[PDB]
Each structure stands twice: as C-alpha cells, then as structure tokens.
Design a protein around this nucleic acid. Sequence first.
DNA 1: CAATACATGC
DNA 2: GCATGTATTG
DNA 3: GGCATCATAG
DNA 4: CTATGATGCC
Lengths: 474, 114, 306
Amino acid sequence: GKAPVDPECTAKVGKAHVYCEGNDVYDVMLNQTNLQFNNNKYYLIQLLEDDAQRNFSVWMRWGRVGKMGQHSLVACSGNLNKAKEIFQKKFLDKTKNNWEDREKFEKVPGKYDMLQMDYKPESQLDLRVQELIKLICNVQAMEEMMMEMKYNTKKAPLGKLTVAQIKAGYQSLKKIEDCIRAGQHGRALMEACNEFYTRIPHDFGLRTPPLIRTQKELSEKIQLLEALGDIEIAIKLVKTELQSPEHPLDQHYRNLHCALRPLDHESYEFKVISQYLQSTHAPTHSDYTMTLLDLFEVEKDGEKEAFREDLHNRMLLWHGSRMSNWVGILSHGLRIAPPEAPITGYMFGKGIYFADMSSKSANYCFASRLKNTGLLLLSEVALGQCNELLEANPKAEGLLQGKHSTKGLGKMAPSSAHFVTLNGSTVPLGPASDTGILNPDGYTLNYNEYIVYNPNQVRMRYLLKVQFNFLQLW
Amino acid sequence: APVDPECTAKVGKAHVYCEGNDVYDVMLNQTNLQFNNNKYYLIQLLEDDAQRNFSVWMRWGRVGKMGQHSLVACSGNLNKAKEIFQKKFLDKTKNNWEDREKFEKVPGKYDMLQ
Amino acid sequence: SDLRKEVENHYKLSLPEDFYHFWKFCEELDPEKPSDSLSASLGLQLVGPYDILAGKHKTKGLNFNLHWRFYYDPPEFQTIIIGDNKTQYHMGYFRDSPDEFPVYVGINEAKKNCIIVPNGDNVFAAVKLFLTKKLKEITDKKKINLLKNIDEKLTEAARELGYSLEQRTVKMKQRDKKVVTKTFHGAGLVVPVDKNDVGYRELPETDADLKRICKTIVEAASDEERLKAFAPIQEMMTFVQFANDECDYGMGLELGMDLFCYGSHYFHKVAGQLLPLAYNLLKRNLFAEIIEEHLANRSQENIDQL
DNA sequence: CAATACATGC
DNA sequence: GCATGTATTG
DNA sequence: GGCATCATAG
DNA sequence: CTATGATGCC
C-alpha cells in the first residue's frame, strides 16, 4: 500500500522516498528481547533515494523500543549497488537471514527477529445520519487515537502492524497458554515469554520484562491485541474514495452497507428505548449519567437470512465499544474471537458477549468528559436455552450439549416479571433486584451476562446515540 | 583547526563559525594507558550561507579511526547550537566553554589540542 | 471489662486486650493521669479510645471516625498515641476490616510523608521501639535513668502478659504472605482471594508511573489542562469498573487509596467514588463511612476535645 | 560513544 | 530541590 | 581466504 | 548499538 518515509529523517523526509521493487520494499523493522538477560531493543532500517537528485542512502535507527535512539544516515551519491549490499549485509548480520529472500524468514535465538508493518454537491442524506457518519468517519480522530496508542498508552510504540503480524502474535499467546497451563516457571516459560515480547513491541523502561504468570495478564494482552486489530480494521474501512462523490462520506456509507434511519423522538420505539436505557442503569456505576440524544434504525444486509428465528428466548441486549471502532461493526457485524487466540483468556469461552443492563456494557464505551459522545448498540439475540454457570470455568463451551448460549449468574439482575415486548422481541426492563442466586462454596458473580456462539444468532436492530454526562470531580 | 574532510556529509558547502577566543571548532584527545583509553572527539559548528541555519558535527573514536559521528541540526537558531556545544563541552570536560582558557585536566575527561 | 463495652460501642470497632492491659499498666504508673504517664518522660500521649478510658470525652456532636485522624491515616488506621506535633508523629492500630483485631501497630508522620511504618504488633512493642530509638537520639546520660526504669516496667509487664517484643512478629510475617500490594502506604492490602485467583488484579500502571501521573495532573496550570491531562485517571477508573464487575474488588480499593495518599483536593471526589464503593463491595461498610466523613472533613487538627 | 534513568548528597 | 555520579543498554 | 562467535571499547 | 578488531573456526 501507500509507502511512507520515516519523518524523523528531517534531512530527507521531503526530498526522498523509500525504495521499492514490486513486492520487495527496502524497509524493515527488527525486534529482539531476552528477559533472561533483559534485552529489549529494536532496529529500523530504511533505504531512501532522494526524489530530486539521484542519490541513495541507508538510514538506520536503534534503541529501546519507545525511546527514540541512535541514528545513522549513510549517503552514497547514487551508488545504489553498494548501498543495497550494505543493507542486505546488515540485515543478515542482525537477523542471520538473507534480505532478498525475505519471504522465507526464520528467526534464530540470540538474534533480532523481523516484523511486518503497514509502511455539483447535492449531499443527499438525513442530517442526523450525516452527523453520525461524520462523527464515526472522522479520519483525524482515528489518526489521533492511533497516536495515543503509541505515546499515551505505550502498546505499539514504533508503529502499526499487519493482520498477519497480529496472527503470529496470537500464535505466541497460544504457546504461552500451553506453557502456563502446566504451572512450570522454568526455562521454557522464559523463552516463550521472550517470543511474545519479540512479536509484540512493549516498553518496560528498565525493569526486567516480567514473566506472564497469571490469567489476568493473558486476558489483558489479548484485549490489547484485539484493540490493535480493531485499529487496523478501522483504518482499512476509512479509505477515502473519488469518482464524484460530492460527499465522500456517502461512499463511506456504502462501505457501511447498512441502512441507518433516523427515528422521531416521539415514536413508541424511541420512548421505549429511552425507558430501557434509563431503567437499567446499574446503581454501582453512578459516577456518570447517560442521556439518549438520538436513536437510529439498523438494517444490515444478509443478517435476516442468518437469524435463528426458530430458537426461543429472543431478547434485546446491549453491546458497547469506543466511538471509533463502530465503523467496522456496521460494515461487517460482530465476530467470534479469532481461532488462534488462547481459550483461557475468556473465563467463559469465546463468542459474542451481551448484557441486558445498559451501564455494564456501557462501561466499554470509554467516553470522556472532554469527549462526551458514546454509542451503545442494541441487538436481538436468540439465546435459546441458556447453560447456567455459577463459577468461572473457561470450558463452558463443551458443557452446552444442546443448549445455544451461556448465562453467567450475577447477584443483581432484572426479573422476568417486568419484561415487556418490542416487535415480538423480549425487552428486559429493570430495575435490578436480588435474584436469590448465591454460592456457599466460592464467590458470586456481580451481574449476569449472556454469551452466544453462533454468529447467526445476532441481529443488530437499533443504534443509540448517547451523551455520557459526567459530574463534579472534586 | 581545519574542518574535518572525513565529514563527507558536510564538506564543501559551509564555513565553520568561530568568534575570536571562542572557536566553535575543536578536537579533544584523551589517552590513559592504565585503562587503554585512547580516544578523540571533534566538534564543529557549520553555518548555511542563505539563512541562519546551523549544524553541529560530533565525531569520536579511537585515535586515527573515524569511529562514530553524529549530526545534530540546528536550523532553528544558532544560539541553540551554542547551547548544545558549550553544554556538551562541560559534560565531557567539566570545564565551561567561557572559562575554557584555564583548562585543568581532571582524570578521565577530555583535553584539547594546544 | 465493664468499661470496655462503652469504648467499643463508641468506635463501632473491637479493641485488642493489650490496649486495656496497657491502660491498667499506665494507671499503675500514674493514677492521676494514666494517659499522659509517658508524656513527661517521652513526650508521647495516649489518645483516642484512651480518651474514653480517661473519661475526657465528658465535656460535650462527636465524630470518632475523625478523632485524631491525621491527614494521611487510612481508614484502616486508628490513631492511639501521639508524639511530636511538629511532624504529627503518631502510632495507631492497623485493622484491615472492622470485624478483625489489629494486625500490628504502625507509625506515621503526617507532616512528613504518607508511609506507615510497622512498629510491632502491640502497643508494648510500639512504645519500646520508640523508647529505644530515642535513647540514642537523646544527647544526654543523666536524663535517662527514668527511661531505664519505665522501660524495665515495660519489659516486665510484657513478659508477664506473654507478649513478644519484636518489631516484626510471626503473625505479621504471616500476614505479609497474604499482603497483595503495598499501595503507596506500604502496609499492604488484604482482600478475599478464591482458588481461581478471583478477587484482585493489578493496576494498568506501575506505582512509580502512578506517582508520576499524580504529579503531572496536580501540577497542571489550568482546569482545562487538567481535564486534558485527566485521560489516564478516567481510563483507570473504567478498567476499575470492569474489575469490580468481575469481583476483583481490591483493584478499585487500591487505586482510590493511592489518591488518598496523594493528598490533593482535586482527587477528593474520585476517591470518594472508588474507595467507599470498594469497601461496600467488600462488606466493610464502616470503612466507607470513615472515608466519606474524612474526605468531607479532612483537617490538619483532629483532637475532638480541642 | 549516546542516552535514560535512579540513587546522590548539601 | 538542584545538579550528576553511576549503572545499564543500544 | 574468508567469515564468524566474541571483546571490548567507545 | 557502530565498529573495528580479535581468535578461532570452516
């Protein structure tokens, strides 16, 4: 794709380009880590030829990942052959792999590993959908969030990654899961951790990179990788388009390929949805309120044929996520976790996750005081017969045996006596009350949650535009 | 005190800045046979002709060999360049640049070429 | 015993037996003013529940959650002895829960820092440690005989009661194995942990980076700059919500505590949203009461009899 | 060497 | 609170 | 000869 | 890390 030049080479950012030849783009990033000996270092290499004058150069820059480091610019006055030689020689020295056949890369212990990078207007639409698309399709905000994913929360310091790089990361998490499952904290565990920290760049300052020892860190790493994938899909979706759009967002909307229609505030549907939002605000999430500003009808192509209409126990359940990634869902729908992801990160397994209490799912929006706009999606989910779970058991999926979804039994939850109906789907109104489920052996889940596995059992139905209103801070 | 020809990335196109006593071009040497230290360090400020656009050259290594070098560009303002130069000289020698005249070789720090 | 139940009814807390035995000890040393029996010799004062023992609360609104509650005394911490008022040096029993006995006696200097230093597991140990440390701090020899005599009485009383005099006892080293994190106060958190490690998870930020976050936020030059800088606190609070939803309550317990330790008023509300709730989730309602009342009225002068 | 950080006393 | 001696890594 | 595990020096 | 240099290996 679009090949960017490292901006840090100020002497060449505007007069020079990264070299390419078909597949082979002479740009590469290497990472190494060995917690046994506490190495955690990167090495970027880029061949740049000037645009204006015929002159090639090799740029190298190295240091601890996150902390910018020592750089070198070697000019060649157009000696492309020597420069390419130097490039390949250094690549081999640092990797033990030849550069030209980069396709068949094999990392070796005690050497750097490679990684893979991404380097007449009649705007006819309802004004409300226009505001929605402009909100979610704001490329500036996506860039700013990506920059925050490097300099605010150091999860991806050096840059972005590819889908396949994420898949290799998942492979390493799988190896970590296998290792940890046997509770052995010796040498193999340290090497597996080395492989993880090699594939996904982290910045530990100086404190020896710690061993991944419990399930909580596994799941956190998994969520980090998921956020990486989310950013990747969001930037893939926001690709701009030409051909007389007179409002490029209309093509972006086609890319959503999902009808989203404005609803009137006085319609039964709007009022009932507001009732459901308000009645189900958990009392233990009282640091903020939420107001329903607007509500949009959802019609996603292909979902109708897939819905398990035959299955009973159909209810409308929440799903929250940050303002930016929603563009992906509306174009592709919700997905089960990747096959290669470790199962043991999900205390009750993979699949699609929903709540019936607005604030619990709403916590996954990460709205802010400065940025007070968030979205909650409502979907009709045919749960069918639920399997009842008292205590965490990541293996819930084997226990289904004919059931179609899992229920995690929370202390606080609405009782079916208050349930109402919307278009023949069950709407589980609150308030939450005690459910008389308790555990005389272990802990008790704070709140119920429902998980489905077949993607065909979800049908998105309305998208909620929500003002999160925070309060006094001191 | 000639501009280093070994700075291929900068030779030919600029004139080193100095001011009387204060010459912002210098080569320092440190020999110490106890620890087998024998290293040099050149520093050079270069000015653009067109605009006030300056660069700081550093070059260091074992005597004779080019070793390593760094270019810190200071197109912003020459005063920044003086800051880098003088601060680095103090860091590396424990002597101020304004007081460079009264140099006292402290152990393990650079002396210059008389 | 007949004067014990009114003491423990006032505080809504149970006090260990060494407290009352030490009261009887100080009574025997000085019947007229047992609480201050060590004040002329050591410059230390018996306060708090000893105030009830002294009947000095009979002059009187009386809020015992704040009585000698210094600026950095966590709700777990019940002040029982005062020293230098210049540094607000003080010693107190440390209870992790209102239904348990103190695990040890800690000391803190509220004008100096927020760190609570273990000082034995009972008041005998705490006073002996202070006495021995001062004995070398005192630049004199003639004015020591009194301390030798009082210390002799301390040792004989502790021996007779069967109390160890070590600065760190066996039970403290056992609790330390149950201590999941220090949380800027160094005293440790005790939270329920089941066989699946459910009950606690670590913060998304390191302790040094947490202190750095607090420094950069509190030093912001405007409220708009703070709101822009506030992003990591909001994120950490959202993740705290996530953790509490999955019964890892101690995380929300710990974060607020660090802000409680940081001391800035800019954090009074957020801690009041985190720490009371965590105590409610942990069924430590009295600590929620204490933190509510302290955050609403966190003063630098705290003797309720004035 | 750069370079960053962490204890380092007055 | 200030600068930096020092150890640690690229 | 030529390259590479390795030094250590800067 | 650059970077030469080193022995020792092939």
